[PDB]
């Protein structure tokens, strides 16, 4: 059966090379590159007393939630730097957080293998754990709400899961990864999502049927970050081999490679600008770089973090970038 | 500011105050990463003192946090950076493992990885040698050659245990990191005293290094 699997893999390789007419670099040799995309730290969010592992913007592009090792989930008013909530976590070992698209819920998880859904908008004025989603047998590396009731989580047990939060039960389990799934990104329409794992492969998952539509293998090392292009027909992955790759869903192969000879450190987080021409990747060299996602040119740099930039996100209105880091600060960039 | 913005700022300042108080309280906690290899004597010392087991207890005006993380049956490097700020690693090694296939060679490889990890350059290790009584029962009959063909030493209990322990300190290869080995028989209710002594020595050595006196 291994022979048949290898034959099918070779057939997929031949099909991918068949569709490789002109590389993204050849078709974007004539577009005018943006010279130096220079964001500047507008707000610095202080109040985390440990390394920050995750942050997630609100859909209102003003509130953001940050997860840190000090056992606190803090909701920030990024405009005024006001702390809207400070949620004490039962497990301090949180390495992911998600903010519900409605804003009524926030999720967190990590080494406790449990996704904790927090009801922000309660009749009481406190934030309480509405639902603890247990069932993953590894640490949760990412979680992403589809809506108030559906959340997709990725775990170190090599499986992504879809949860019905009201019942607390896994609606679907997305098996097929061989290494620890490290990140998720839902499509803008949230009908399907990509997940990067330690097997250096990003898989495209259909939410309803639970079937892996496509598998993308371009990286040499552990994929730490993944993010759809704004139109949902492509995505970008960030792996430990210091390179980002732009895979197309329809083309089913990498289109562009975002690597620089000065960069040898791994990539913790990636995100796109609202138009998608910028690919903001957070690196282990303590700063975030900005990439011309169409020309692979390093458009700019986001320096200002004294430790590894573990997470970064762009507002749904594309106005600002928040980059958390292990130095316990979130900086808002414009 | 508006009246509502003023009250929101007041709430934010209250949140900041509570965060600072919680950080002050958490800074007084001595964080220990409790490791081991499969069937090692981790559970015995756990009783003496899901995905991660966190144990809080106070000993001699010191509040310890034991992070038992062996249940994480995945790649360690994907979660070992969470414990970058641990005071020490309480490594458990079953002495009665040289005769079981190899268990203790896997423990030695894990110990080498823990010592040479980029996040544990200056993080001390409180090595515990577990089940030393069964090791003594098994060491008189079977010699210490299955685990160490290069042993070439006396078949005695003390020499065999010292050889295993010394092979363990051999992986330290660091000036700012020390290994505080102890021998345990699973029937001694003073292992937390050994952990406390090791942690006290760790704090004293860190303070001396800050003073330039170490």
């Amino acid at each position, epitope marked *: 059966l291994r022979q048949e699997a290898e034959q099918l893999k070779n057939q997929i390789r031949d099909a991918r090379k068949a569709c490789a007419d002109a590389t993204l670099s050849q078709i974007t040799n004539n577009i005018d590159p943006v010279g130096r995309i220079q964001m500047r730290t507008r707000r610095t969010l202080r109040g985390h007393l440990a390394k920050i592992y995750a942050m997630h913007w609100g859909t209102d592009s*003003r509130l953001l939630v940050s997860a840190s090792q000090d056992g606190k989930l803090i909701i920030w008013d990024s405009y005024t730097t006001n702390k809207v909530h400070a949620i004490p976590l039962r497990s301090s070992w949180v390495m992911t957080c998600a903010y519900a698209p409605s804003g009524n819920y926030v999720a967190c998880g990590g080494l406790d293998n449990i996704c904790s859904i927090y009801n922000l908008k309660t009749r009481e004025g406190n934030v309480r754990v509405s639902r603890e989603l247990a069932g993953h047998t590894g640490y949760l590396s990412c979680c992403r709400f589809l809506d108030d009731n559906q959340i997709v989580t990725s775990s170190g047990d090599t499986t992504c899961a879809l949860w019905d939060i009201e019942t607390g039960q896994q609606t679907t389990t997305f098996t097929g990864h061989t290494g620890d799934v490290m990140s998720l990104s839902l499509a803008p329409d949230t009908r399907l999502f990509v997940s990067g794992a330690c097997d250096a492969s990003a898989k495209l998952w259909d939410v309803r049927e639970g079937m892996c539509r496509q598998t993308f293998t371009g990286h040499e090392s552990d994929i730490n970050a993944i993010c759809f292009f704004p139109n949902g027909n492509a995505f970008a992955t960030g792996s430990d081999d210091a390179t980002c790759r732009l895979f197309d869903l329809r083309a089913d192969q990498e289109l562009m490679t975002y690597s620089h000879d000065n960069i040898i450190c791994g990539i913790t987080s990636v995100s796109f600008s609202k138009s998608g021409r910028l690919l903001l990747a957070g690196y282990d060299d303590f700063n975030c770089n900005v990439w011309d996602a169409l020309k692979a040119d390093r458009a700019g740099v986001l320096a200002g973090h004294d430790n590894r930039v573990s997470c970064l996100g762009v507002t749904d209105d594309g106005m600002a970038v928040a980059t958390g880091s292990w130095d316990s600060f979130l900086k808002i960039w414009n | 500011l508006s009246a509502e913005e003023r009250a929101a700022l007041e709430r934010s300042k209250a949140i900041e105050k509570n965060l600072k108080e919680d950080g002050i309280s958490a800074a007084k906690d001595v964080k220990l990463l409790l490791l081991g290899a499969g069937e090692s004597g981790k559970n015995t010392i756990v009783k003496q003192m899901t995905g991660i087991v966190e144990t809080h207890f106070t000993f001699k005006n010191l509040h310890f946090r034991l992070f038992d993380v062996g249940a994480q049956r995945s790649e360690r490097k994907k979660w070992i950076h969470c414990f970058e700020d641990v005071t020490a690693i309480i490594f458990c090694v079953a002495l009665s493992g040289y005769d079981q296939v190899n268990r203790m060679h896997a423990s030695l490889k894990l110990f080498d990885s823990i010592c040479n990890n980029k996040f544990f350059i200056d993080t001390s290790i409180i090595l515990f040698l577990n089940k030393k009584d069964l090791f003594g029962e098994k060491i008189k009959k079977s010699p210490l050659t299955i685990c160490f063909p290069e042993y070439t030493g006396p078949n005695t209990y003390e020499d065999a245990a010292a050889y295993i322990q010394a092979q363990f300190e051999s992986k330290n290869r660091s000036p700012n990191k020390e290994i505080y080995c102890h021998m345990t028989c699973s029937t001694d209710t003073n292992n937390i005293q050994v952990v406390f002594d090791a942690v006290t020595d760790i704090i004293i050595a860190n303070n001396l290094r800050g003073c330039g006196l170490y």
Partner: single-chain antibody
Amino acid sequence: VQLVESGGGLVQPGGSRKLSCSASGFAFSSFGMHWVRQAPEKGLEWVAYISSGSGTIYYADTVKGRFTISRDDPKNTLFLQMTSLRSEDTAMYYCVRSIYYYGSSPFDFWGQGTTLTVSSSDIVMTQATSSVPVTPGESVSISCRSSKSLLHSNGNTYLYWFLQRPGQSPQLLIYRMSNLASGVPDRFSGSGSGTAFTLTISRLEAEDVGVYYCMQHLEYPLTFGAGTKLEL
């Protein structure tokens, strides 16, 4: 969630009493609590405010000095220390639950109120309409006027709408102008700009009969408009 006021009763003029609020069912420590009184025939009138943790306190300019608002978080009790009780201090005193952050809904829960009987620059909120006849099933608009623009430099308009249903304490309808309160059916709608506002009800029910109050929360001496009663 319930707020129970105790005390009130009958007091001689110039006397003194303490009003108590036995808050229960919610995280009382995190709420800025108000005292809002309503004269036996008049409309609501905000009395005092003690923030979360007692850090910030305001009083109505007509009760300042005579009244003292205090809270007891461990026992979740809110106090109004009333002294020199003039004849104009007779009213039903409502304790009001209010929490302030981004997106919060202040004034959302009102205590049932306690009756006090005493023997014998501020923004002006105007409700020119009052006691308007309405019929079930038809749309009605309740208007409001403000002396100062309630819209702030941040883009937020601090206009509140409450419903003094007959025999029931006020219940929030729209907390910031055009922001429906929790549990309020989506037929009430708020709109306006600057100083002029309107509360629109799509298909008014039999439960929509009551008295509708404005409130500004821009400058802190919070002022209500004289209620615009709805009757069949």
